[PDB]
PDB file of C-alpha atoms and ligand atoms in Angstrom:
ATOM      1  CA  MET G   1     -42.919  -4.777  21.139  1.00 32.28           C
ATOM      2  CA  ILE G   2     -43.985  -7.245  18.144  1.00 32.24           C
ATOM      3  CA  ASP G   3     -41.768  -8.804  15.225  1.00 31.64           C
ATOM      4  CA  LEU G   4     -42.866  -8.999  12.503  1.00 31.90           C
ATOM      5  CA  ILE G   5     -41.359 -11.751  10.194  1.00 33.09           C
ATOM      6  CA  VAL G   6     -43.560 -12.084   6.114  1.00 32.92           C
ATOM      7  CA  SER G   7     -42.909 -14.832   4.055  1.00 33.51           C
ATOM      8  CA  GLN G   8     -42.603 -13.655   0.473  1.00 32.23           C
ATOM      9  CA  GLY G   9     -40.997 -16.911  -1.152  1.00 32.76           C
ATOM     10  CA  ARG G  10     -42.345 -19.792  -2.198  1.00 35.13           C
ATOM     11  CA  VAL G  11     -42.439 -23.149  -0.185  1.00 35.08           C
ATOM     12  CA  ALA G  12     -44.804 -25.549  -2.373  1.00 36.54           C
ATOM     13  CA  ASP G  13     -47.234 -22.570  -3.322  1.00 37.01           C
ATOM     14  CA  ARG G  14     -50.442 -24.528  -4.958  1.00 37.62           C
ATOM     15  CA  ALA G  15     -52.403 -21.112  -4.512  1.00 38.44           C
ATOM     16  CA  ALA G  16     -51.767 -18.235  -6.955  1.00 37.48           C
ATOM     17  CA  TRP G  17     -52.380 -15.486  -4.059  1.00 38.78           C
ATOM     18  CA  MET G  18     -51.006 -17.235  -0.400  1.00 39.93           C
ATOM     19  CA  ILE G  19     -47.583 -15.205  -1.056  1.00 41.47           C
ATOM     20  CA  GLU G  20     -50.198 -12.188  -2.024  1.00 40.87           C
ATOM     21  CA  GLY G  21     -52.311 -12.321   0.258  1.00 40.85           C
ATOM     22  CA  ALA G  22     -49.268 -12.412   3.258  1.00 40.57           C
ATOM     23  CA  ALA G  23     -48.309  -8.776   1.791  1.00 40.07           C
ATOM     24  CA  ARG G  24     -51.396  -7.561   2.228  1.00 41.92           C
ATOM     25  CA  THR G  25     -52.078  -8.861   5.589  1.00 38.83           C
ATOM     26  CA  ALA G  26     -48.240  -7.498   6.715  1.00 40.67           C
ATOM     27  CA  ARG G  27     -48.877  -4.163   5.492  1.00 39.32           C
ATOM     28  CA  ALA G  28     -52.223  -3.993   7.636  1.00 40.95           C
ATOM     29  CA  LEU G  29     -50.523  -4.568  10.587  1.00 41.85           C
ATOM     30  CA  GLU G  30     -47.707  -2.315   9.077  1.00 40.85           C
ATOM     31  CA  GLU G  31     -50.249   0.574   9.529  1.00 40.61           C
ATOM     32  CA  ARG G  32     -51.946  -0.574  11.999  1.00 38.10           C
ATOM     33  CA  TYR G  33     -49.356  -0.544  14.708  1.00 35.24           C
ATOM     34  CA  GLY G  34     -46.674   1.071  13.222  1.00 32.42           C
ATOM     35  CA  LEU G  35     -44.539  -1.423  12.439  1.00 34.85           C
ATOM     36  CA  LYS G  36     -41.678  -2.821   9.501  1.00 33.83           C
ATOM     37  CA  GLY G  37     -41.291  -6.070   8.242  1.00 31.15           C
ATOM     38  CA  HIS G  38     -38.564  -7.543   7.915  1.00 33.30           C
ATOM     39  CA  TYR G  39     -39.926  -9.575   4.368  1.00 33.27           C
ATOM     40  CA  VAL G  40     -37.947 -12.963   3.794  1.00 28.87           C
ATOM     41  CA  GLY G  41     -37.727 -14.504   0.226  1.00 30.25           C
ATOM     42  CA  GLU G  42     -38.149 -14.360  -3.268  1.00 32.02           C
ATOM     43  CA  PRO G  43     -41.894 -14.509  -4.777  1.00 33.22           C
ATOM     44  CA  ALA G  44     -42.384 -17.977  -7.313  1.00 28.02           C
ATOM     45  CA  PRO G  45     -45.025 -18.779  -9.076  1.00 27.95           C
ATOM     46  CA  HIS G  46     -47.236 -21.590  -7.929  1.00 26.88           C
ATOM     47  CA  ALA G  47     -46.825 -25.064  -9.327  1.00 30.15           C
ATOM     48  CA  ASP G  48     -48.297 -28.283  -8.695  1.00 28.00           C
ATOM     49  CA  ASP G  49     -44.999 -30.011  -7.499  1.00 29.79           C
ATOM     50  CA  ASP G  50     -44.717 -32.330  -5.564  1.00 30.66           C
ATOM     51  CA  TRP G  51     -43.024 -31.748  -1.912  1.00 28.34           C
ATOM     52  CA  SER G  52     -39.522 -33.777  -2.418  1.00 27.54           C
ATOM     53  CA  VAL G  53     -38.917 -31.835  -4.752  1.00 29.53           C
ATOM     54  CA  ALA G  54     -41.554 -28.409  -3.549  1.00 27.86           C
ATOM     55  CA  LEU G  55     -39.655 -28.766  -0.699  1.00 26.00           C
ATOM     56  CA  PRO G  56     -35.836 -28.744  -1.319  1.00 26.69           C
ATOM     57  CA  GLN G  57     -37.122 -25.619  -3.817  1.00 30.39           C
ATOM     58  CA  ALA G  58     -38.282 -24.087  -0.575  1.00 32.36           C
ATOM     59  CA  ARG G  59     -35.158 -24.667   1.748  1.00 34.88           C
ATOM     60  CA  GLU G  60     -33.414 -20.604   1.382  1.00 38.43           C
ATOM     61  CA  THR G  61     -36.618 -19.536   2.618  1.00 39.44           C
ATOM     62  CA  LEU G  62     -36.884 -21.995   4.703  1.00 40.96           C
ATOM     63  CA  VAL G  63     -33.468 -21.252   5.883  1.00 40.67           C
ATOM     64  CA  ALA G  64     -33.705 -17.055   6.243  1.00 42.44           C
ATOM     65  CA  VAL G  65     -38.123 -17.699   8.106  1.00 37.99           C
ATOM     66  CA  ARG G  66     -35.688 -19.670  10.390  1.00 37.54           C
ATOM     67  CA  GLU G  67     -32.870 -17.784  11.593  1.00 36.01           C
ATOM     68  CA  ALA G  68     -35.370 -14.799  11.675  1.00 36.47           C
ATOM     69  CA  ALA G  69     -37.669 -16.636  13.608  1.00 41.28           C
ATOM     70  CA  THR G  70     -35.216 -18.171  16.240  1.00 44.39           C
ATOM     71  CA  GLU G  71     -33.961 -13.842  16.626  1.00 45.83           C
ATOM     72  CA  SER G  72     -37.696 -13.378  17.493  1.00 46.50           C
ATOM     73  CA  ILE G  73     -37.980 -15.973  20.321  1.00 44.71           C
ATOM     74  CA  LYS G  74     -34.736 -15.582  21.803  1.00 45.95           C
ATOM     75  CA  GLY G  75     -35.936 -11.783  22.152  1.00 47.01           C
ATOM     76  CA  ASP G  76     -38.660  -9.780  24.304  1.00 49.09           C
ATOM     77  CA  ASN G  77     -40.923  -9.517  21.767  1.00 47.38           C
ATOM     78  CA  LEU G  78     -44.044 -11.099  20.744  1.00 46.20           C
ATOM     79  CA  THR G  79     -43.322 -13.282  17.186  1.00 46.52           C
ATOM     80  CA  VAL G  80     -45.056 -12.962  14.741  1.00 47.68           C
ATOM     81  CA  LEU G  81     -45.135 -14.315  11.182  1.00 46.13           C
ATOM     82  CA  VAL G  82     -47.221 -13.420   7.989  1.00 47.20           C
ATOM     83  CA  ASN G  83     -46.699 -16.749   6.145  1.00 46.46           C
ATOM     84  CA  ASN G  84     -47.552 -17.618   2.584  1.00 47.27           C
ATOM     85  CA  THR G  85     -48.557 -20.971   3.183  1.00 46.69           C
ATOM     86  CA  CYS G  86     -48.501 -23.098   6.198  1.00 47.85           C
ATOM     87  CA  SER G  87     -44.949 -24.806   4.980  1.00 47.35           C
ATOM     88  CA  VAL G  88     -43.282 -21.703   6.140  1.00 48.77           C
ATOM     89  CA  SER G  89     -43.764 -23.344   9.993  1.00 47.47           C
ATOM     90  CA  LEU G  90     -41.667 -27.018   9.196  1.00 48.86           C
ATOM     91  CA  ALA G  91     -39.099 -24.392   9.041  1.00 47.67           C
ATOM     92  CA  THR G  92     -40.891 -21.917  12.496  1.00 47.60           C
ATOM     93  CA  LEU G  93     -42.436 -25.097  14.717  1.00 45.85           C
ATOM     94  CA  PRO G  94     -38.790 -26.648  15.035  1.00 45.07           C
ATOM     95  CA  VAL G  95     -36.933 -23.582  17.435  1.00 45.92           C
ATOM     96  CA  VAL G  96     -40.570 -22.979  18.919  1.00 45.39           C
ATOM     97  CA  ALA G  97     -40.455 -26.588  20.115  1.00 46.53           C
ATOM     98  CA  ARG G  98     -36.382 -26.071  20.728  1.00 48.60           C
ATOM     99  CA  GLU G  99     -36.705 -23.416  22.746  1.00 50.95           C
ATOM    100  CA  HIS G 100     -40.120 -23.665  24.632  1.00 50.64           C
ATOM    101  CA  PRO G 101     -40.513 -27.012  25.271  1.00 51.35           C
ATOM    102  CA  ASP G 102     -43.667 -26.493  26.859  1.00 54.98           C
ATOM    103  CA  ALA G 103     -45.179 -25.086  25.545  1.00 57.01           C
ATOM    104  CA  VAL G 104     -48.196 -25.893  23.990  1.00 58.23           C
ATOM    105  CA  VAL G 105     -48.842 -24.942  19.435  1.00 59.25           C
ATOM    106  CA  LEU G 106     -52.381 -24.279  18.599  1.00 60.27           C
ATOM    107  CA  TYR G 107     -53.020 -25.128  15.224  1.00 56.49           C
ATOM    108  CA  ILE G 108     -55.706 -23.406  14.016  1.00 55.94           C
ATOM    109  CA  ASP G 109     -56.750 -24.974  10.476  1.00 55.75           C
ATOM    110  CA  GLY G 110     -59.723 -26.668   8.839  1.00 56.91           C
ATOM    111  CA  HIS G 111     -57.286 -29.213   7.557  1.00 55.67           C
ATOM    112  CA  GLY G 112     -55.525 -31.332  10.195  1.00 54.24           C
ATOM    113  CA  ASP G 113     -51.933 -30.807   7.794  1.00 50.72           C
ATOM    114  CA  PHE G 114     -50.758 -34.568   9.239  1.00 51.24           C
ATOM    115  CA  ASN G 115     -49.994 -36.285   6.019  1.00 48.18           C
ATOM    116  CA  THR G 116     -46.957 -38.022   6.261  1.00 48.86           C
ATOM    117  CA  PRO G 117     -44.690 -39.046   2.551  1.00 49.67           C
ATOM    118  CA  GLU G 118     -46.127 -42.602   2.438  1.00 48.95           C
ATOM    119  CA  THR G 119     -50.193 -41.412   3.347  1.00 48.90           C
ATOM    120  CA  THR G 120     -50.418 -37.968   1.370  1.00 48.53           C
ATOM    121  CA  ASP G 121     -52.778 -38.984  -1.851  1.00 48.64           C
ATOM    122  CA  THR G 122     -51.819 -35.101  -3.531  1.00 49.63           C
ATOM    123  CA  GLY G 123     -48.150 -35.345  -2.532  1.00 51.49           C
ATOM    124  CA  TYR G 124     -48.359 -32.082  -0.781  1.00 52.33           C
ATOM    125  CA  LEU G 125     -46.263 -30.266   0.951  1.00 54.41           C
ATOM    126  CA  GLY G 126     -48.819 -28.425   3.037  1.00 54.73           C
ATOM    127  CA  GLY G 127     -51.054 -31.628   4.124  1.00 51.84           C
ATOM    128  CA  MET G 128     -47.893 -32.327   5.952  1.00 51.53           C
ATOM    129  CA  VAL G 129     -46.830 -29.825   8.148  1.00 51.68           C
ATOM    130  CA  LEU G 130     -47.737 -31.037  11.697  1.00 50.03           C
ATOM    131  CA  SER G 131     -46.376 -34.138  10.734  1.00 51.47           C
ATOM    132  CA  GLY G 132     -43.321 -32.832  10.309  1.00 50.28           C
ATOM    133  CA  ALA G 133     -42.431 -31.153  12.930  1.00 51.17           C
ATOM    134  CA  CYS G 134     -43.734 -33.813  15.113  1.00 49.81           C
ATOM    135  CA  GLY G 135     -41.618 -36.020  13.350  1.00 49.06           C
ATOM    136  CA  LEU G 136     -42.811 -38.855  12.203  1.00 50.51           C
ATOM    137  CA  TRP G 137     -41.638 -37.676   8.663  1.00 50.40           C
ATOM    138  CA  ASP G 138     -37.635 -35.996   8.200  1.00 49.81           C
ATOM    139  CA  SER G 139     -38.404 -32.792   6.718  1.00 48.46           C
ATOM    140  CA  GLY G 140     -34.856 -31.763   6.751  1.00 51.50           C
ATOM    141  CA  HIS G 141     -35.702 -28.376   9.293  1.00 50.17           C
ATOM    142  CA  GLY G 142     -35.630 -30.590  12.244  1.00 51.00           C
ATOM    143  CA  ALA G 143     -38.544 -32.030  14.048  1.00 52.44           C
ATOM    144  CA  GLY G 144     -38.914 -32.282  18.221  1.00 52.90           C
ATOM    145  CA  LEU G 145     -42.574 -31.070  18.599  1.00 50.48           C
ATOM    146  CA  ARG G 146     -44.072 -33.330  20.750  1.00 51.48           C
ATOM    147  CA  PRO G 147     -47.860 -34.491  19.209  1.00 48.91           C
ATOM    148  CA  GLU G 148     -48.637 -34.382  22.259  1.00 49.15           C
ATOM    149  CA  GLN G 149     -48.574 -30.599  23.406  1.00 45.92           C
ATOM    150  CA  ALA G 150     -50.465 -30.396  19.783  1.00 45.04           C
ATOM    151  CA  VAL G 151     -53.870 -29.327  19.741  1.00 47.42           C
ATOM    152  CA  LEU G 152     -55.307 -29.013  15.682  1.00 43.87           C
ATOM    153  CA  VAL G 153     -58.455 -26.277  16.844  1.00 45.27           C
ATOM    154  CA  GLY G 154     -61.769 -26.145  13.665  1.00 42.38           C
ATOM    155  CA  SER G 155     -60.015 -29.690  11.573  1.00 41.80           C
ATOM    156  CA  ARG G 156     -62.893 -31.620  10.761  1.00 40.92           C
ATOM    157  CA  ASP G 157     -64.418 -34.484   6.911  1.00 40.57           C
ATOM    158  CA  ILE G 158     -60.690 -35.539   8.009  1.00 40.27           C
ATOM    159  CA  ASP G 159     -60.115 -38.311   6.118  1.00 42.64           C
ATOM    160  CA  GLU G 160     -60.011 -41.784   7.799  1.00 43.77           C
ATOM    161  CA  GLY G 161     -55.805 -42.525   8.164  1.00 45.38           C
ATOM    162  CA  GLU G 162     -54.769 -39.330   9.312  1.00 45.27           C
ATOM    163  CA  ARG G 163     -57.094 -39.274  11.616  1.00 47.57           C
ATOM    164  CA  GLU G 164     -55.935 -42.402  12.568  1.00 46.09           C
ATOM    165  CA  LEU G 165     -52.642 -41.387  12.681  1.00 44.71           C
ATOM    166  CA  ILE G 166     -53.448 -37.900  14.862  1.00 43.93           C
ATOM    167  CA  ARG G 167     -55.075 -40.080  16.929  1.00 47.33           C
ATOM    168  CA  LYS G 168     -52.053 -42.336  17.478  1.00 47.13           C
ATOM    169  CA  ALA G 169     -49.705 -39.637  18.545  1.00 44.35           C
ATOM    170  CA  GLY G 170     -51.487 -38.070  20.496  1.00 45.60           C
ATOM    171  CA  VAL G 171     -52.958 -34.687  18.764  1.00 45.42           C
ATOM    172  CA  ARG G 172     -55.992 -33.822  20.134  1.00 49.02           C
ATOM    173  CA  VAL G 173     -58.324 -33.050  18.022  1.00 47.10           C
ATOM    174  CA  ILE G 174     -60.802 -29.451  18.898  1.00 46.80           C
ATOM    175  CA  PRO G 175     -63.553 -29.279  15.999  1.00 48.06           C
ATOM    176  CA  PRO G 176     -65.344 -25.696  15.739  1.00 47.66           C
ATOM    177  CA  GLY G 177     -68.172 -27.003  17.271  1.00 52.20           C
ATOM    178  CA  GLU G 178     -66.441 -27.000  20.415  1.00 55.67           C
ATOM    179  CA  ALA G 179     -63.388 -24.583  19.977  1.00 50.49           C
ATOM    180  CA  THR G 180     -64.986 -21.649  22.345  1.00 48.73           C
ATOM    181  CA  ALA G 181     -62.582 -20.338  24.024  1.00 48.60           C
ATOM    182  CA  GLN G 182     -62.519 -21.796  27.527  1.00 49.58           C
ATOM    183  CA  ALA G 183     -61.938 -25.826  25.493  1.00 48.38           C
ATOM    184  CA  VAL G 184     -58.585 -23.889  23.883  1.00 49.19           C
ATOM    185  CA  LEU G 185     -57.620 -22.697  27.760  1.00 48.82           C
ATOM    186  CA  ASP G 186     -58.525 -26.245  29.065  1.00 44.53           C
ATOM    187  CA  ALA G 187     -56.424 -27.763  26.326  1.00 47.67           C
ATOM    188  CA  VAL G 188     -53.547 -25.497  27.415  1.00 43.41           C
ATOM    189  CA  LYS G 189     -53.472 -25.280  31.046  1.00 45.90           C
ATOM    190  CA  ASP G 190     -50.851 -23.643  32.097  1.00 41.25           C
ATOM    191  CA  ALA G 191     -48.399 -23.592  28.854  1.00 41.13           C
ATOM    192  CA  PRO G 192     -47.172 -20.835  26.804  1.00 37.76           C
ATOM    193  CA  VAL G 193     -48.824 -20.819  23.617  1.00 34.94           C
ATOM    194  CA  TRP G 194     -47.562 -20.880  20.036  1.00 36.14           C
ATOM    195  CA  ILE G 195     -50.949 -19.679  17.360  1.00 34.40           C
ATOM    196  CA  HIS G 196     -50.379 -20.852  13.763  1.00 31.78           C
ATOM    197  CA  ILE G 197     -53.911 -20.325  12.054  1.00 31.67           C
ATOM    198  CA  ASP G 198     -54.845 -21.883   8.386  1.00 28.88           C
ATOM    199  CA  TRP G 199     -57.939 -19.232   7.038  1.00 28.38           C
ATOM    200  CA  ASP G 200     -59.073 -22.082   5.411  1.00 25.01           C
ATOM    201  CA  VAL G 201     -60.473 -23.003   9.061  1.00 27.21           C
ATOM    202  CA  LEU G 202     -62.947 -20.021   8.827  1.00 28.32           C
ATOM    203  CA  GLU G 203     -66.628 -20.801   8.063  1.00 25.96           C
ATOM    204  CA  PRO G 204     -67.066 -19.484   4.311  1.00 27.02           C
ATOM    205  CA  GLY G 205     -67.864 -16.119   5.172  1.00 25.58           C
ATOM    206  CA  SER G 206     -72.748 -14.990   4.261  1.00 25.24           C
ATOM    207  CA  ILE G 207     -74.235 -12.667   5.566  1.00 23.73           C
ATOM    208  CA  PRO G 208     -77.697 -14.394   6.056  1.00 22.05           C
ATOM    209  CA  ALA G 209     -76.448 -16.892   9.032  1.00 21.66           C
ATOM    210  CA  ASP G 210     -78.262 -16.546  11.675  1.00 23.55           C
ATOM    211  CA  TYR G 211     -80.931 -19.681  11.156  1.00 19.25           C
ATOM    212  CA  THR G 212     -77.899 -22.407  10.424  1.00 17.74           C
ATOM    213  CA  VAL G 213     -74.937 -23.903  11.776  1.00 20.64           C
ATOM    214  CA  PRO G 214     -71.607 -23.631  10.203  1.00 19.17           C
ATOM    215  CA  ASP G 215     -68.794 -26.439   9.331  1.00 16.70           C
ATOM    216  CA  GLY G 216     -65.957 -23.252  10.092  1.00 16.30           C
ATOM    217  CA  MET G 217     -64.521 -21.187  12.572  1.00 19.23           C
ATOM    218  CA  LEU G 218     -66.674 -18.046  13.094  1.00 16.80           C
ATOM    219  CA  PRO G 219     -64.267 -15.131  12.751  1.00 16.89           C
ATOM    220  CA  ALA G 220     -65.736 -14.936  16.302  1.00 13.81           C
ATOM    221  CA  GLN G 221     -64.733 -18.022  17.641  1.00 16.42           C
ATOM    222  CA  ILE G 222     -61.253 -16.731  16.574  1.00 17.65           C
ATOM    223  CA  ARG G 223     -61.100 -13.720  18.583  1.00 18.27           C
ATOM    224  CA  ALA G 224     -62.382 -15.126  21.242  1.00 21.45           C
ATOM    225  CA  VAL G 225     -59.398 -17.527  21.733  1.00 23.55           C
ATOM    226  CA  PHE G 226     -56.867 -14.325  21.015  1.00 24.25           C
ATOM    227  CA  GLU G 227     -59.094 -12.399  24.164  1.00 26.09           C
ATOM    228  CA  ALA G 228     -58.554 -15.591  26.313  1.00 25.69           C
ATOM    229  CA  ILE G 229     -54.847 -16.410  26.090  1.00 27.63           C
ATOM    230  CA  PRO G 230     -53.042 -14.387  28.063  1.00 26.36           C
ATOM    231  CA  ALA G 231     -50.185 -12.286  26.719  1.00 29.03           C
ATOM    232  CA  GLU G 232     -47.468 -13.155  29.055  1.00 30.26           C
ATOM    233  CA  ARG G 233     -48.021 -16.254  27.556  1.00 28.34           C
ATOM    234  CA  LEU G 234     -48.349 -15.243  24.102  1.00 26.37           C
ATOM    235  CA  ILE G 235     -45.152 -16.899  22.457  1.00 26.67           C
ATOM    236  CA  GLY G 236     -45.652 -15.984  18.787  1.00 23.58           C
ATOM    237  CA  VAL G 237     -48.531 -16.144  16.278  1.00 21.01           C
ATOM    238  CA  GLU G 238     -48.178 -17.043  12.678  1.00 20.96           C
ATOM    239  CA  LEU G 239     -51.185 -16.261  10.403  1.00 17.46           C
ATOM    240  CA  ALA G 240     -51.338 -18.587   6.453  1.00 17.51           C
ATOM    241  CA  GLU G 241     -52.912 -18.856   3.784  1.00 19.78           C
ATOM    242  CA  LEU G 242     -55.374 -15.627   2.823  1.00 18.58           C
ATOM    243  CA  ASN G 243     -55.625 -15.780  -1.059  1.00 20.61           C
ATOM    244  CA  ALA G 244     -56.185 -13.452  -2.487  1.00 21.03           C
ATOM    245  CA  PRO G 245     -54.674 -11.228  -5.013  1.00 21.15           C
ATOM    246  CA  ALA G 246     -53.045  -8.388  -4.442  1.00 19.40           C
ATOM    247  CA  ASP G 247     -54.933  -4.249  -4.788  1.00 20.01           C
ATOM    248  CA  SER G 248     -58.155  -6.368  -4.611  1.00 19.90           C
ATOM    249  CA  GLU G 249     -61.227  -5.159  -2.819  1.00 18.03           C
ATOM    250  CA  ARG G 250     -61.383  -9.053  -1.818  1.00 20.77           C
ATOM    251  CA  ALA G 251     -57.734  -8.413  -0.036  1.00 23.85           C
ATOM    252  CA  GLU G 252     -58.806  -5.428   0.938  1.00 22.01           C
ATOM    253  CA  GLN G 253     -61.687  -6.700   2.873  1.00 24.63           C
ATOM    254  CA  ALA G 254     -60.315 -10.609   4.386  1.00 25.39           C
ATOM    255  CA  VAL G 255     -57.545  -7.978   5.916  1.00 24.00           C
ATOM    256  CA  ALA G 256     -60.129  -6.135   8.618  1.00 24.91           C
ATOM    257  CA  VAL G 257     -61.206  -9.220   8.919  1.00 26.07           C
ATOM    258  CA  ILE G 258     -58.394 -10.462  10.414  1.00 22.65           C
ATOM    259  CA  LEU G 259     -57.048  -7.461  11.539  1.00 21.72           C
ATOM    260  CA  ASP G 260     -60.252  -8.017  13.926  1.00 21.49           C
ATOM    261  CA  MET G 261     -59.567 -10.853  14.917  1.00 18.15           C
ATOM    262  CA  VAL G 262     -55.989 -10.780  15.895  1.00 19.72           C
ATOM    263  CA  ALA G 263     -56.276  -6.802  17.700  1.00 22.28           C
ATOM    264  CA  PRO G 264     -56.773  -8.582  21.341  1.00 20.80           C
ATOM    265  CA  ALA G 265     -53.674 -10.797  21.547  1.00 19.23           C
ATOM    266  CA  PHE G 266     -51.453  -7.607  19.340  1.00 25.21           C
ATOM    267  CA  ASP G 267     -52.863  -4.441  20.864  1.00 23.21           C
ATOM    268  CA  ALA G 268     -51.924  -5.738  23.949  1.00 21.49           C
ATOM    269  CA  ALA G 269     -47.890  -6.826  22.353  1.00 24.89           C
ATOM    270  CA  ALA G 270     -47.722  -3.834  21.729  1.00 24.18           C
ATOM    271  CA  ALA G 271     -48.927  -1.931  24.124  1.00 24.60           C
TER     272      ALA G 271
HETATM  273 MG1   MG P 301     -41.308 -13.911  22.613  1.00 24.87          MG
HETATM  274 MN1   MN P 302     -52.777 -25.783   6.516  1.00 25.47          MN
HETATM  275 MN1   MN P 303     -56.134 -25.554   5.691  1.00 24.54          MN
END
């Protein structure tokens, strides 16, 4: 009762190992849950190209992710997308909002990902994902997600202008120190839920973290969110931006922490 879809095509990647991090995450989920992922797109090396160049390059991959996710959303299973970059969600979030106009999108990310072509400082498409899905600029892959239905969770240190774009659109922001499970449940109310996770939301993991207050979200906070959302309300989950080389012990250790965070939701969907 889980559908696993895996992006392996470049979607504006500026990091070297996010396609590889996606592949390793999918492999861990295949082994734990007895699943076989549907792998979409062909890898291409990372580059520092402008969104206006990277976006057309990604069209084939984005269109294929859209069709796979659409079928899954219309079916009876939990839709799980393991995505190299948040930019894959320019294809999926318009489908979520059209199929489930009452869904709340929990966009869990250390960033706001709410830049527009006018406001981006770096030209990076991955900084423009949530604004594109919400129609502030035209990605060519649709929009229709109400900003009033989007909640940024874990975001912090947002550029002043971007923060005002978020505010004016009506996107709520729950910073890591407010992002308890109940705070998230309060934001969702009775709505069905789509969860999008960018792993740079997580506090850089240190061992003796008992005596300092973290700046990012802790894995335990992410797990508590997955424990809190009722399985009957969970539409789907996107896991994005694990930058870890294939065959590395780093990737091995990272996917074990990921599986621990997602287990309450994925175990329930499987059984
Ligand atoms: Mg479903
Ligand atoms: Mn992101
Ligand atoms: Mn981010």
